[model samples]
Target: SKTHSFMTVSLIELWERFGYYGMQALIVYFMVQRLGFDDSRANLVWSACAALIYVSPAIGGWVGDKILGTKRTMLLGAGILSVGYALMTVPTENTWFMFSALGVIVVGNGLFKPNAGNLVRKIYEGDDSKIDSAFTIYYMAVNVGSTFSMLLTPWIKDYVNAQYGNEFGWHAAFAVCCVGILVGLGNYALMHKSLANYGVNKKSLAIVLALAALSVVASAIILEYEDVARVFVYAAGVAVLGIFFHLIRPSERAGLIAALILTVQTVFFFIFYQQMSTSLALFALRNVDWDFWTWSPAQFQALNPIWIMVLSPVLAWSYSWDFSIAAKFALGFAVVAIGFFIYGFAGQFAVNGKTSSWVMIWGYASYSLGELLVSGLGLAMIARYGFMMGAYFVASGISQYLGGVVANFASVPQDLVDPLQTLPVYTNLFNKLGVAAVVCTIIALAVLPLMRRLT
Candidate 1:
């Protein structure tokens, strides 16, 4: 029954990420190609929302632990996520409406993200190795859902666009994202009995209203200005440090220290991660010659999830071996460096400004393996060290905004339309990030011995 409960949890999580990647696969293109946003505006706006989506989990984790029960809050989040996606299905181009919809998703992801992981934590309480292996497999569920959505949505967008015209394909693709959540919800309705042993939420009606209010406030902030959002992102970084110091007793100080160290490393990885939707997506648009299906540039982002699906089973199964999490992370950074350097070095082969399709193929192949070791182990690190998953997410939240900042480094000038003119813009960023990844490897390797003591 415990096993069945976890499967139910993972299946819904799969669908949640399915919606996330599917919608995210096209969001930047929607802004630049349709809604007439500058690439910078679109990147920052999405980053602002992504930042909040991760940040709100701090409070949401608390809500799961004390106010609303974990199981119930997760369900509410899913329903709210469905509503947010449904909003995108509306064909209007109003900026306010788009921001408002994203704000809803922030709150939805807030409530959904940490609690589900916590449920996994509770299910395998105090069993360190068990929890690590469980989270590795659990992360696989995320890729499984995202893999399908990332590939399907872009193709769907193309099909609907050609068939119906007026760019209806964009919204039609989003409708599929909405339907995905509803289907997951339906699956939960049938399987929820497996979760009966878990306690539900603390509140009834008032808290839900409070959640709605939070959504409105989040929307207002997202729509306000990037400066204000930057303020919160800075504050969130400090808040994470503050929480670690106070949230845990002095008795288990080492574990807290180790968790914080790993969190910092996780933060770095996601900045590189954010490039998938921003710099890398755009790079595909202007600089790469497509070889697979003559893909929509957006579809190229599917490479990450594809590699994720391919590698996770083997990686998760390898948990049977004895290896330090910190050591694996060091190796992970080295692998990521390989991916970025591939992106960087591919410029050498450019003829009239376009790189071969094989660059993305091998780059992501190496890149996702790095994530499997680092970000894949991230939740398990916190769970093993016994800190609030909220704090862990806070690191990712802040990193995303920083990632947007990094992606901005590659934004092309409107005057420069040639791949020849723009290739350097992206390859330079990739090369810089690749060096950063190498630096991270040394940093993690340096900290390895210390992490050993703490663990």
Candidate 2:
């Protein structure tokens, strides 16, 4: 019965994730193509908005743990999400509306984000060994959601635009998100009795809803001024976290140290992890010729997830024995940096406008290998070491939010020399990645001693 409940929640969570990612896949295209925004500006806006998506989960987790209870918070979150998606149907008439609407969606995500995972977790709380396997299954659901969203969003956008018009494209694409959330809500409501067997409570739900509300209000106010919003969000998040630390009991010094180390790690991850949007995008758009490859430029996005699902298990299995934690991380870091190196070489081919698609795949596969080893294990270690179970996990989300800000700063628009004519797009791609990777390598290695002290 517990297993069944876990499976059910997992499916629901997957659907919600699919909705979120689907919308993300379309956001930049809509802004650049439909809204007539500059590409660099659109990218900047999207980074901040996307970071906010993960930032709110900590408050959501807090509410679930202390106030609203998981079940009711989940339901409230679903409801907010439904409305937020509905708002996406509105035309992007001004920057204000876009910021405001995104604010709504981000807060809604926060409420729903941590709660669903917690509900899945309740099913296997007692069996320590099974917990890893259980989470592995849950993580699969997350990827499934992301993969389907990637496939569905573009298709839906094309279909809607073809039938109606370009004016209605973003609206229709995100309308699909509304439908996904509604479906999740329906399933959750029907399975309330089943979920209660796991002690999913109401107060915790209410608390999350409240914090989610605060997030919406705060972010909306901050984002009105684009130059300052990102920093404001980071500071507010830090202050909130500091309060959380103060509230912790004195007896758990070890756990507190663990949390501190994990939090710092989150900071590093935030700074470098944003290569996905910043360095990666610049490499693809400026350096690589998408026409040479059969796959769409957007399709390069697929490689990361593929590596995640395939290579993750192998790495996990290999590391299950007594392995040195620092050794594992060093290997992970090296592989990731090497991925940049491989992509750099591929970029050399790209200079002539005909790099093989295989080169791109191989580079991404290396990146995936590194991500699988580092991040996948990092999660387990944090959970093992930190007392603030949900909060520590949420710290990762918060760190990503901060990472988005750093990436935003790191963002240097690709020099727009025509790829078909004379510009060395390949070298440009490689250069951007090379710079970021070198800096990240230094930062990551430098921080290890501090992390070791904490661990």
Candidate 3:
């Protein structure tokens, strides 16, 4: 029945997500531990690499739709992922190898991601309304996949070391990625024809792919440049790519602008929002009571996502459809400010040797609420904008990258080396983050009216 087919498609989609998140959850930690990179260095490299991966999907989607055909592209993507995972198993600390593997995986994802979503729609075929419900069901697949990795990957890593040794158990993690890719690839091959109506194929795909390759190479080269040269290259590439897109077909300029503005604004929000990972991590380590229940500083990172998983759906169902998306964003910004304050207060407790796990829970809960509002809705807005959506997603990743830069190079504690001031180091750090959250929130809110006007 159609329902059965939909469930199968959703399961495959979940598998795809498992592969992606497996890589993601491990990236920063792997860089820090496996490569022996310092926290700052690790975050910086991961930031750049992560953004590159996030940004490459647009080209992948274009190629799949036009040149490679959906089935072949997805298979090709799986092949690339397999190779990337295999390359990652080299058991050495080479940044070049890591970056190269990341590149291939990023491109592979672009191709695979769009197609998987397409198959979900194809399941519902002629019914447009059903497509929406189908996608809702499809998204649940992602959460399922995410949940799987959260459980399996860690357990695998732990089990491997216990059975074998610590020498290369990290490589064992990448091996799990290999298995995930192989499984998905096998599933795709079996199901390809059943999903044929959704596929892209040879002839037209050939022409589009030629153009796409040129664009990708140009982007890769341009991205390596910096400062004024980088801006010029991007502007030129965008102009050229715009011409190509326009020549393919012309549509209203409004949608393009809407997507562009939305992406940029979302990136701005992300700059503050993503600070949870980099700056907040640093703050917690430097200040929070990491030993209360004997938790790793980095492990606390899991707390935010766990809370979001619990709280998001209930909030989603409670809200009405047309309830001022922009206003909701403002409230989310405010919540982030509060989260930072909780973190700051917790830091004070830690300084006084009176910190409780509850303090961390409060901070995590506040940030989780902010995430539920800003990040959750930001992604929805991106998809609603389609062609503009990819750009926004990339922008969000870039903002996260920028947040790392800010945390690594731009952070300053509120007070230092002043005997008269004499602020506790922990208090100073939290207060600094709190001030940043407030300032970022206020600036975002002040611009909302104008952003709305432009929208």
Candidate 4:
């Protein structure tokens, strides 16, 4: 049954995400604690790395469709990804090697991410209704992998650090990621029979490999010169949106225009969301009370998936209400705005050197529900070349770079002993961001009627 094949692909995706997110959850700490980078530089390097990870998929899609074919591309991606993770396990202070490892991961993900999704579609061919359900299950596989890794790797890092020493834990955590991807590749090879008739031409393999090599080289350069990369990211974002506008037919223009507008609005949402890895992580360490539970910075990331798991059923029930999707966006913005305001308020109440963890937990809870609302509303309103895809790159890539920039507004000097003195920086920034979110909500409301009509 195609169902069997679909499940196989989902399994592959599950393990791939396990490896990817496992490494991702630890990347910033690896930069700061291991490589000795300051907050600003670490954020910039990570922004460049993350941006390229998202941007490369656009190229990967072209290569898969035209050159190497889906199955082979995925194989190449899984293999390359394993190698990239293996590189991260090398205990070294060498900055270039670290950057190169990130470059390799970016290339591997570019190839793997899009092709995996494409394979699901291939498996579900000829059944449009089943495609939606199949992808829903497929994405659930993603969340499952992410949730597992987000919890697991941080624990691995903490455990290894406890036993082996601080220097060993980061490398050990990354090694686990390498083993995970290899396990996925192994299973994929054994289940080759399930994906029959899904192979690509051998003739274009060399050409595709060459393109991938060039992309890897480009990635290394981008990580090294992140400022230049930021410029390119912004350019690529505008170009992608322009391409979306250009590609639309006259009849579909109204809906697409509305989508593009909403797409621009979505960028602000991601800017706030991206704080999870950079600023918010830092805040948890310097500000929040860890007296309740022994916590590492990486462990803080688990809050997102944890909250999502808890609230999924609640949000599912709420969606049954007869509310327009546009109205939901407004609600999402307003709710998330309140969450940011909570953070800002909590910042004001910093006690004898630290704020209460419960306050930040409250903020996360509020934002998580709001995130579910906006995230659940997919780009169904837009036709072909929906801005959501482009917005994803822009939001995840360019917006993340901006997130790094904004984080600098709150960053204290690395050598400063009393880091808590800089608490106002985080609080003030959150306050401004919350206000921006409210403004976004109001705009969403204003545009709701037009968006409803277009839909």
Candidate 5:
């Protein structure tokens, strides 16, 4: 029964992601190319939507209090998600329409995601041994779905634009995301009885509109940022750390302290992670030499998920080889540095300002491993965490905005299109990013002794 239900949940997850990554691959590029928003706007707006998406689920985790309950709730969420996907299919250039579409999906996910995830936990409620296996399979499904869609949509967009011209092409490919959701829902219908025990399901108008407004507001704040930006981190920092220290459970002080240290590192980690959606994604579009055998920019985005798919099991096995997590963190930074250096180095080899596709390939290879090391571990390292729980994601959300700022470091102007000149610009940014993260790791490694002591 658990196995059967687990398949159902993973399929649901697979397509839910199919919807997001399908859009994810396009959103930034779409905003920039189609909507004419410029890179800065594209990056920050998308990050705001994402930051809120991460934040909203924290509430839904408790609210899920879904088959009739979980099943109906999730199906409804999927249905609403399709609505958002369809809205994007309209192919209008009105920026408000895009934001409105993003808003609807955000609300849908806020409700849909938490309950869907809870079902996975529910199925494995009593069995700890098989639990890890189930989640591994679940995440594997995530990779499978995201990897496929990320790879698929751009090509569809590319092909459609080439044949039909750009008018219908972008939105035309996006329709596949709707396809993903419907296909999953169809399977779930056939197997709906499998969740006979999963129990339960919603309303509201002003609430949805309010959520829609916030998506616009969040996007606006990121653009007006700086004093506003620092204020976000500072207000969140003082507000949270003060509470974390004041409520000092003597019982949790050292462990809590340990988490905070790693929290900062985790915060730093996502600044780089957000690039997959922002700077790096755009890089493949403008500068990378995809000439020999061309592929979509989303194909480059596809590599990170694929590399993660390959290396999650590798790192999974590495722990069995007895590597320390601290050691893993340190090594991750080194790998990240190497990846950036690879980017910087590839700049020298540019022909007409574009680096080979293999460079993006190798750089993502290295980046994803670092991702597994630092970020993947960021998830594992933080234990005994609540409001502070929200704090991690909040801190992470703040960093997502900061990452938008970081992307600006490499922002080449629209009029300046020389690959040679732009090559140096982005490489300069990558080298600095590598150094910034490496400097943080100095502190990361310094904590090894205290962390061992905390244990």
Candidate 6:
């Protein structure tokens, strides 16, 4: 029965990721192509929204843990997500609607995302050994959903646009996301009984809603004032870390130190992770051979997830061979650096009108291996280190916001007609980041003994 419940929860998450990434796969492009947002402006809004998405889960977990309970909060989140995605289908020249839609999605993701993981934890409450494997499988589910949505939504956009001779395809693709979530909601309902006795409280629902609204409003403000948002996010991130340190007990000091150190380290990794939706996405548009396999630039985003789908199991199996968690992370960091180096080297091929698609193909393959080492092990690390998952995500969100700011350095002018104008920007950023990744890996290695002692 517990196994069945676990599968149910996993499938629910699969569909939810499908809907979320489907919308995500196209949003930046939509902001630029459909809404006419400059690269800086678009990145600001997207980063702000992404930051909020991670930040909200902390509060949502509290709401579920304290007031509403996980299942109910998750349901509310799903319903709200459906509405938010549906709103994206409303084509409007007004930018307010875009922000409004993003705000809605943030709220929905906050409520839904954390609680789903919580459900898995509950389902595997006992049997410590099985927990790692369970989450590894769970991460595989994430890649599977992401892979499907990344491919499908972009195809939908291109197919519809080609058929109609119009750019209405983005809207249509978003609507499909709405439909996908609704399907998940229905499946969840059918399995509702299995999740009984969870999250029945409503005592703090009003408070949660109020706080969420305030967060959305604050996020909107940051989105409008692009210059200050990254700074704000960074400060807020530091504050969160300070709070975590203050909250830890004396006996747990070593564990907290290890967790915080790892948390800080992962911020650098997440910057690269976030490039899929920002710098890399833009690069695909200008430099890569988007016409290869009849794919749109957005479809290139599928590569990360596709590689994850193919490689996660092999990595997961290798993890069983008794490598220490720190050792695994060191390898992950090194591999990710190599992946970025590949991108930097591939820039040489962009001399003419375009770059070879093989660049991303190879880059994503390396990145996915690193993802298996880090992200695949992330949850397990948090559990072992005695920290809340929210803290990990908050740190990641802050770094992702910084990544957006970094990506903005490569933002090309709107009127730049040639790929040559943008190629240098991407190559330079990739090369610099590759060097930084190596530095970060060295720092992690130096701290390896400390982490081993703490664990």
Residue ranges of candidate 5 with Cα displaced over 4 Å? 66-68, 125-127, 194-238, 245-252, 291-294, 318-324, 375-386
What is the lDDT for 199 in model 5? 44
Candidate scoring better on TM-score of 2 and 4: 4
Per-residue lDDT for 158-252 in model 1, tens only? 88888987457898889889999998876863475533123533355486657676775666665557787878778877888887778565436
Looking at candidate 6, what is the lDDT of residue 15?
87
Off by over 4 Å in 1: 2-4, 121-133, 196-203, 238-261, 316-325, 375-392, 452-455
Instruction: Assess the local accuracy of residue 234 in candidate 3 as a C-alpha lDDT between 0 and 100.
Output: 48
Model 3 residue 228 CA deviation (Å) reads 13
What is candidate 3's CA lDDT for residue 237?
42
Q: Tens-digit lDDT track for model 6 on 87-136?
A: 88876756777677788888888888888888777676555788767877
All candidates: TM-score? 0.87, 0.79, 0.73, 0.89, 0.88, 0.89
Model 3 TM-score is 0.73
lDDT of 2 by residue, 1-455 (tens): 67767767887888787777777766766665577655456655676676667666766666655666577666677778888887788876766676667788887777677787777666655547877788888887877777776666666776777788875766887888878888877675557444422244456445545656677767776655657765665665776587457746433554455546545555555545555554454445443344431334444655666668887667657534342255445565566666766665664563455444566577778867766666543445644333344455545555655544544443344354454532244345455555665555565566556455544
CA lDDT, every prediction? 0.78, 0.63, 0.59, 0.75, 0.72, 0.76
Q: TM-score: which is higher, 3 or 5?
A: 5
The predicted structure with the larger TM-score, 1 or 4, is 4
| lDDT (tens digit, per residue) of candidate 3 on 1-455 | 67766765677666766766666666666665456555556556555555656566666666666666665676676676777777766667545666667656766677777766666666665457887767765765676676666446645655675677764576677778777877877674566354533434566656655644454444334333334333542453465346436533523443444444445556656666556566565444444355532344444555655676777577768654353366556677678777767765654454454344566667878877876676444455533224434444545556656666665643333333332233244345556766766665666566555445434
Which candidate achieves the best lDDT against the true structure? Answer: 1
Q: After superposing candidate 4, which stretches have Cα over 4 Å from the reference? A: 195-203, 237-257, 291-293, 318-324, 376-380, 383-396
Question: Any residue pairs clashing in model 1, and if so which?
Answer: 68-201, 68-202, 69-200, 69-201
Prediction RMSDs, each to the true structure? 3.6, 4.9, 6.3, 3.0, 3.5, 3.1
Candidate 1 backbone clash number: 4
